[PDB]
Symmetry: D2
């Protein structure tokens, strides 16, 4: 069958979150062996139990650089080699830029970009040694449009794309692709305002993003690298 991920090992960060969970479900549904990263092992273990077999659980605080490294090493070790890394864990520290503290900036950049750097660095050379890999970075519509109140988040998510393109160029000839998915507004006055800019006039759901992950993760998407797949109900058209 097509887009079959049977036997592929996938690590999904922020897997307890709505998107992470959906992504983890789709990969699992496609035969993947899925490592669920989160901060709280209890919640991860529940997801693990609800999904069933072919699941690993890997708690780690992604703001802790040594724990990010240990996470990559542990997932790589216990899964017997990670083939698919889904960098999905992200944080926001929303707020107007002029009120934006160093910590709100630093926290978002550290988790959303630097932790991704480090986790990816743990797994990239292993994937190239195996001459097969998928790095799939969950960015946001907002990394390409901008969004007020999100100078930090936008910088990190845009940075994540730039990071991805560079890495893509570097490791492409070794059969590791690196791509981004840019969710629009996903179910997780204000709503109507956002909805007004969505041609489809519905929120996204985790499964919208999860299917794009499976697509990118698949053997069939081996010729796709350095790309940003916009899954956003037409909210921004690239």
């Amino acid at each position: 069958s097509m887009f079959d991920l049977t036997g592929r090992k996938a690590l999904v960060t922020g897997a307890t979150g709505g998107l992470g969970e959906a992504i983890a479900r789709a990969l699992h549904a496609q035969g993947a062996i899925v490592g669920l990263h989160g901060t709280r092992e209890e919640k991860l273990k529940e997801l693990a139990a609800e999904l069933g077999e072919r699941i690993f659980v890997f708690p780690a605080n992604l703001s802790d650089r040594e724990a990010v490294k240990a996470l990559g090493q542990k997932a790589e070790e216990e899964m017997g080699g990670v083939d698919i890394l889904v960098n999905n864990a992200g944080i926001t520290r929303d707020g107007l830029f002029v009120r934006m503290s160093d910590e709100d900036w630093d926290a978002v950049l550290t988790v959303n970009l630097t932790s991704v750097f480090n986790l990816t660095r743990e797994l990239t050379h292993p994937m190239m040694r195996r001459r097969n890999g998928r790095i799939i970075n969950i960015t946001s519509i907002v990394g390409v449009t901008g969004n007020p109140g999100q100078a930090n988040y936008c910088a990190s998510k845009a940075g994540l794309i730039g990071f991805s393109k560079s890495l893509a160029q570097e490791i492409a000839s070794r059969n590791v692709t690196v791509n981004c998915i840019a969710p629009g507004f996903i179910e997780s006055k204000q709503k109507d305002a956002i909805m007004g800019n969505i041609p489809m006039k519905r929120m996204g759901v985790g499964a919208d993003i999860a299917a794009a992950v499976v697509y990118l993760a698949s053997d069939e998407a081996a010729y796709v690298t350095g790309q940003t797949l916009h899954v956003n109900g037409g909210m921004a058209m690239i």
Copy 2:
């Protein structure tokens, strides 16, 4: 049915289905359980591909230069397949050469087939799709529509226009659960100085194959891609990164 990216019973029309990409697209769509309308110009080669795949296939010869034939194509496909769910606008032509040497005919031919024939074919099938509250319009553009490419002023205009067309249309028909998206192939296997030089620009250091494009078509055609519209999916070995 209900499995991931399943297209069982979905009716797809593929233009330029005898070509490299078109054939791969038709095969992948067919493999995914789709009923496939094979468009081409050489009715023979069409019937021959129809025979290889066997069942769930229609053959639809048409000259896409001929605006009335394009209109007939869409109507015939809409009728005989019992409604088209998936339109893959894949057929395209080139009339390459420097702009300073580029005749009115070279320009007109490329724009009419690559853009206008797409507008017309799409116009035939769009409302039917909207009435069905389900459709996929998948337009095969080119990396070159986004990058530019010397010797292809006409082709680049047509392929860039195709994208702008798709974005406008995606916006109009999104509330009707008809998506419209483009796939931008990079250089797809279809002298050693030329190939060497193109490959030097492809991070992956290999040519694409039809199946690379076909799989992107299956993805966008899928129910799972219901929240994707107005987008351009670059399948190019990293040759341009958007």
Copy 3:
């Protein structure tokens, strides 16, 4: 800086809001400006006003032979066009499902094919002079898409694709080709999507044309300059 003294500029749609503002800025920067339009009276008016360094070139841009005659006329009479501003554009707005062949055809013909032809008239001369500026006024909508404008969007998106291709061809000849994408130029529905919360004026686009036309933008080619109050951010 950004001096265009003695540069010959041909501005299509020069009688309209943008075209007029463009012509004015170019003239203000020392350019000799060829004013294209269909309204001969409005052309004479602007010419009489700007005074010196003006040529007037009426042409129906739907008429292909007339487009070529325009390019030839401006090249011959201006003594070599240095700057072509393709600004003239039409809409035939309407939902795609009701969109006639003629509404599509007319928009693509004028917005894309007439640009193709005018540009072809002037390209080899510019290249022969190893100096030129082709500046194409596209639209935000060519990048974003817009409902009601499947034709216009296609033409303006296509205008950009054309420009990139041409830019790569002729860059070594010191002829640059660039697009400017105005946002909304003189509905609170529209301004709701514009961070700046005001409309663009012709002078906003005119200044962008002067920048791209300038010797100082000699290293800028194949690009799209978005002048849209933040309405879309590329």
Copy 4:
């Protein structure tokens, strides 16, 4: 005259480097009062000497967070309000991603993005108060294209653009614009082969783009990325 910057106060970071010098010279030629930032005072005083009038000199280590903040406060103070901030100073720590140290990554992200965030934060509220401002960020072609050996640099430069867009959205109604210039290759045959113009950019190519975005005439331009690259990438 058009694109006049007379009486505009500009702060240019990395003003002693290739681009920075060219930018500061173009701003000065257009009548701007230019604050020259750099790491070494000797270099800065040299540039200031030759430019003569309407110059300030602000040395600062941009990798030092408190120096960055002090820089912004000092410039805003001594210049009587900064109208134009040109974030131009950036560093590289190039190398294979598999060999990329935390230090190589951190250093580039801190200088190229975080120091920009802090410098910009120092000057944004003032500009917004005045209802006038230009934040002009020097990114790189490579922030849009990617480039091997620069995972860190490309992340920083792409992130710079995303930052700029978000900020542009936030402060646009206060008529403070924020834009990026993406220089291509500024003054090997492999590189040149991908440049349609078949020449390197010079500092002036970038400075002129800075003058344009800084101008009142570019008041309707925000959240944008102006690519100045001889056609090397066409967006």
